Design a protein around this nucleic acid. Structure first.
Ligand code: MG
Ligand code: MG
Ligand code: MG
Ligand code: MG
Ligand code: MG
Ligand code: MG
Ligand code: MG
Ligand code: MG
Ligand code: MG
Ligand code: MG
Ligand code: MG
Ligand code: MG
Ligand code: MG
Ligand code: MG
Ligand code: MG
Ligand code: MG
Ligand code: MG
Ligand code: MG
Ligand code: MG
Lengths: 60, 75, 65, 117, 113
RNA sequence: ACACCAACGGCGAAAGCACUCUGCUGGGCCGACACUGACACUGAGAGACGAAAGCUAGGGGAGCGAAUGGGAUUAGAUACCCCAGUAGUCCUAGCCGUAAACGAUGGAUACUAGGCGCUGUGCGUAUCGACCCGUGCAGUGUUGUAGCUAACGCGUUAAGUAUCCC
């Protein structure tokens, strides 16, 4: 069903914001129905983006 | 290229990776994970040498004089 | 500034729907359980207890229903 | 004393008491209401009821200043989290936003131990 | 196509203050391109996306002592091939500048999922 | 000190290792004959590593908090609870070598039903790129047949059937 066909990075914000919560929390693998490999790569990505202020830790 | 499985080539590859590892072990002294590996590989090389000493005396002495390997502990 | 929960009240406002919307926002982020959790200190053991308990609770609630 | 049309209400709900402060967007405090300042003491001071009268008591002075719209700030795990909101509502003042500000460390100062009770 | 001969592939993002002109920006560009090429970079490929509001407010102190609080920012993107040895100074050299508010560099691995 | 991710998930010889990143490096596993040709397994002595508390020397000191002090509670309370709070916790360079250091299970090899799962890869299929399926390995988890056991239980990751060393 849902899948990643495009290279996932910290700069594809559309992608990463799918897998982020309203509060900017990272959603679990069981929810996102991703292979473990994927999920890890997402996670690190999100953190990197978070540091570069592409996505917020907390909200306004 | 030559024999990549030959005793003498292997012992070389080992002696070389060890003297290489030596610099890293000198710069970062706190890395025990790496040292443990060093001790393992040195063990391997020492084994092969003992083997080779059993099998061929000549090839052995030639080798440890060639690669500057310290003389054996059976003396 | 910062915020955890955002409840914006429109002008259709009545007290109970507002109160419960907010209540489910707090249930949704799990903030009160959170501050009952960080009230005191837990050794790694009560963390593994809490993880197994809560995770397998909501997980077996997902696999039964 | 100061007539301010729109401002913010901070309500801190702790387990032993709830404080309700009223301020304005300039980040300036106008008037506050504590559950202890209403003539409640240690036990009762935590009950959602004392929080109710605390909230009502602040909003008295805020309508006395003639203010209309407000934002609500809720900080802390205690009971008044839900109770105070009600009084904010029935006190007939327009509710703009209701936010939860309870601070969540992302890691940090190691909390006190567990009471063995 | 990209083909490093005994080099590592890299990406680097830099975040700069919004108060900058295009000439000061291109001067920075020029400068860092030169540090890379002076460090043994074959293929310096730079790309720019400027002026986006940040997720959050960041603070940068200057050499003039200014406290600068920002909201927007200038993102510079760098694909380049440098020896693993030479990546060392670059990062600090980016930290040290007052114009560069937030820097980060990543090694790039081939994706296989 | 590193929320969410986090999982009855990952690596590590064990101790342990998690915000992010880069660099130096240790292992692992898999597929191909490319090669050597028994070079194996174990290990008395010996060596290295080895939670936390502890110690020597220099830094550092927010929070927590032995000791200590006050407040209570109690017949008493040198305790539990509360208010304060020093060592210590942190870093550098060392010493100490002990833990329910636990799988309470030394190591290697061979061989003996399955069912349901996961992690890594490989193959064939599915499309010609993500699944998908069936399978080959390598590890990891839960039920359970034979057999074992004083019972509990263990059960291809044995506590089964045998061989070797400590
Ligand atoms: Mg109480
Ligand atoms: Mg393992
Ligand atoms: Mg490696
Ligand atoms: Mg032959
Ligand atoms: Mg011994
Ligand atoms: Mg020692
Ligand atoms: Mg210690
Ligand atoms: Mg002492
Ligand atoms: Mg204290
Ligand atoms: Mg006392
Ligand atoms: Mg204190
Ligand atoms: Mg030490
Ligand atoms: Mg012992
Ligand atoms: Mg024992
Ligand atoms: Mg499937
Ligand atoms: Mg197996
Ligand atoms: Mg079991
Ligand atoms: Mg069983
Ligand atoms: Mg037995």
């Amino acid at each position: 069903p849902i899948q990643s066909g495009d290279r996932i990075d910290y700069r594809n914000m559309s992608l990463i914001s799918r897998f982020i919560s309203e509060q900017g929390k990272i959603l679990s693998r069981r929810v996102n129905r991703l292979t473990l490999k994927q999920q890890r790569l997402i996670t690190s990505a999100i953190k990197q983006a978070r540091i570069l202020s592409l996505l917020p830790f907390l909200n306004n | 290229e030559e024999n990549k499985g030959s005793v003498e080539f292997q012992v070389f590859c080992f002696t070389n990776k060890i003297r290489r590892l030596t610099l890293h072990l000198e710069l970062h002294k706190k890395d025990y994970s790496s040292q443990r590996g060093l001790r393992k590989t040195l063990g391997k090389r020492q084994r092969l040498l003992a083997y080779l000493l059993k099998i061929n005396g000549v090839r052995y002495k030639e080798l440890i004089s060639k690669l500057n390997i310290r003389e054996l502990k059976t003396r | 500034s910062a915020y955890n929960v955002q409840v914006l009240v429109d002008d259709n406002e009545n007290e109970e729907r507002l109160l419960n919307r907010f209540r489910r926002e707090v249930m949704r982020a799990g903030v009160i359980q959170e501050c009952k959790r960080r009230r005191y200190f837990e050794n790694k053991q009560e963390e593994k207890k809490r993880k197994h308990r809560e995770a397998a609770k909501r997980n077996s609630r997902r696999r039964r229903g | 004393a100061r007539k301010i049309p729109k401002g913010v209400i901070h309500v801190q709900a702790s387990f032993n008491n709830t404080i309700v402060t009223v301020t304005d967007v300039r980040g300036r405090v106008v008037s506050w209401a504590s559950a202890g300042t209403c003539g409640f003491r240690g036990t009762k001071r935590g009950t959602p009821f004392a929080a109710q009268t605390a909230a009502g008591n602040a909003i008295r002075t805020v309508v006395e200043q003639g203010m209309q719209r407000a934002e609500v700030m809720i900080k802390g795990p205690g009971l008044g989290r839900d109770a105070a909101l009600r009084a904010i509502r029935r006190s007939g003042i327009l509710l703009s936003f209701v936010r939860d500000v309870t601070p969540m460390p992302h890691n940090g100062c190691r909390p006190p131990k567990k009471r063995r009770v | 196509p990209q083909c490093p001969p005994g080099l590592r592939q890299y990406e680097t993002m830099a975040v700069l203050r919004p108060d900058m002109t295009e000439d000061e920006r291109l001067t920075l560009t020029q400068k860092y391109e030169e540090l890379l090429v002076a460090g043994g970079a074959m293929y310096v490929e730079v790309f720019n996306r400027g002026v986006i509001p940040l997720a959050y407010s960041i603070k940068r102190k200057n050499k003039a002592g200014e406290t600068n609080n920002y909201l927007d920012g200038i993102y510079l993107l760098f694909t380049y091939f440098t020896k693993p040895e030479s990546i060392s100074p670059l990062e600090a050299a980016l930290v040290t500048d007052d114009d560069v508010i937030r820097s980060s560099s990543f090694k790039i691995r081939k994706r296989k999922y």
